[PDB]
């Protein structure tokens, strides 16, 4: 905070996603329902793109579900990760890579604004 999306890294050259870490240590239980985890990373996005926050498979398989989230092109707030412990108690350590940001083209349409 406030760090822009350009400070994010890719695991490897062919990785679709930019890694997102939580800035806090947080414990999640199933009965808590959706929680919004801070990343300290902020919009906006490159021109003509929008973003999608998705889970990392290794984290999904460990029982933390990330709800897919749309990041609008002109969002200037903090990108947060919407997450829920599926079945068990999940512990997120500070700096753990818990989600990924995918960049996608933003298609123009004549839809009324």
């Amino acid at each position: 905070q406030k760090q822009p999306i350009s400070k994010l890294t890719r695991a490897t050259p062919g990785s679709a996603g930019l890694d997102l870490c939580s800035t806090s240590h947080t414990v999640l239980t199933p009965e808590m329902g959706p929680q919004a985890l801070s990343t300290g990373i902020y919009g906006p996005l490159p021109p003509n793109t929008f973003g999608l926050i998705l889970g990392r498979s290794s984290i999904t398989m460990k029982g933390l579900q990330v709800y897919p989230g749309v990041i609008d092109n002109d969002y200037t707030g903090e990108i947060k990760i919407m997450a829920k412990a599926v079945n068990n108690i999940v512990t997120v350590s500070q700096g753990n890579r818990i989600a990924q940001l995918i960049l996608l083209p933003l298609i123009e349409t004549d839809n009324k604004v």
Copy 2:
């Protein structure tokens, strides 16, 4: 019904998604499992595009999960929202914006049909 996708609106110019509302008042509980909510909006999509139905974050955080759904380019039926109450009883009022439609390019491949 039957309204085409062109009647949908964007919240703002840089919003990735087109808002989708339910045409009915519906109550959802966790034990009901996935439910398909009517929108009165119909395919098909613009040429060379397909659609993805995603949650709105403000609705996800209130405990209604929208399952990501693929809308095929040539689908001519009613676009429905697949939704589940996560932990608590959720009440959807008629006209509440509960999901969003994202348009994405449809890539051609040589895969057999």
Copy 3:
């Protein structure tokens, strides 16, 4: 196994997704949490693309949730489907089409690798 993505089929010409079947008979219950189902299909993907594994709506409505999964362009392993029974006992028969692979453009960015 090992079959490449090019052996996948589309249901119809305008279908966004390539169908993915499980190679095993598997029973899933809610208390099992996320499970990774084998497909016998392998990366990598076409140049400048990445993949997203999504649910088929007819399967989602029957109570099997597929967690959206990112397939990296240069992944050479087996594409697995991350799935969870929502509320009830779900039985997957061998050869049942349980998910779909969507191909999307991979946008270049200056993000550090």
